[PDB]
Amino acid sequence: RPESELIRQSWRVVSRSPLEHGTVLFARLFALEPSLLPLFQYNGRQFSSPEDSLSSPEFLDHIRKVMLVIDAAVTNVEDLSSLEEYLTSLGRKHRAVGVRLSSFSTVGESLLYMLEKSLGPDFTPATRTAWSRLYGAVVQAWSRGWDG
């Protein structure tokens, strides 16, 4: 489908350097919602500043995991069911770590922000809309983790 192609094609560029692009995503995320910072608790320690997170190997590893889940959604765009059980569990895991379902809308905004800045002129409003649909679909699946 044309919309599925809009997603695939846009993802191609940022998929080539996932850590660099995911770093933009998480920098934007903390700027928008600073209270997400303390939810990373590697070695039982809290990051004081957002820039502290960027020196942490485990935090950077987590960026790679996020970008790989998104890549999975892109491979399955139009095939989004295939991932429902995995997303529900991933959702439950985040509830357990203390992320509120609401904070995932901020994640969506950060993903769209990162795509916009990476695509520039290529970020057509059809692509913003398509990604909004895809992300909306990911979030619904995700949400089931919170039991509603």
Which residues have C-beta within 8 Å of that of residue 76, sequence separation ≥ 6?
82, 83
Q: Is 94 in the site for ligand HEM (CB under 6 A)?
A: yes
35-54: contacts with ligand HEM (CB under 6 A):
36, 39-40
Flag whether 21 is marked binding: no
- Residue of 69, 80, 101, 119 interacting with ligand HEM (CB under 6 A): 69
Q: Using the minimum distance from each CB to ligand HEM, give the nearer residue, 4 or 105.
A: 105
Q: Which residues of 61-91 are buried (b: 16+ CB within 10 A; e: fewer)?
A: ebbeeebeebeebbebbeeeeebeeebbebb
Q: Is 70 in the site for ligand HEM (CB under 6 A)?
A: yes
Q: Using the minimum distance from each CB to ligand HEM, give the nearer residue, 1 or 96.
A: 96
Q: Is 133 in the site for ligand HEM (CB under 6 A)?
A: no
Q: Using the minimum distance from each CB to ligand HEM, give the nearer residue, 61 or 124.
A: 61
> Where do we find the tokens 């379902």?
101
In SS3 terms, 64-124 reads as HHHHHHHHHHHHCCCCHHHHHHHHHHHHHHHHHHCCCCCHHHHHHHHHHHHHHHHHHHHCC
**Which residues are documented as binding site for heme b?**
62, 94
Q: Which residues bind ligand HEM (CB under 6 A)?
A: 36, 39-40, 58, 62, 65-66, 69-70, 90, 93-94, 97, 99, 103, 107
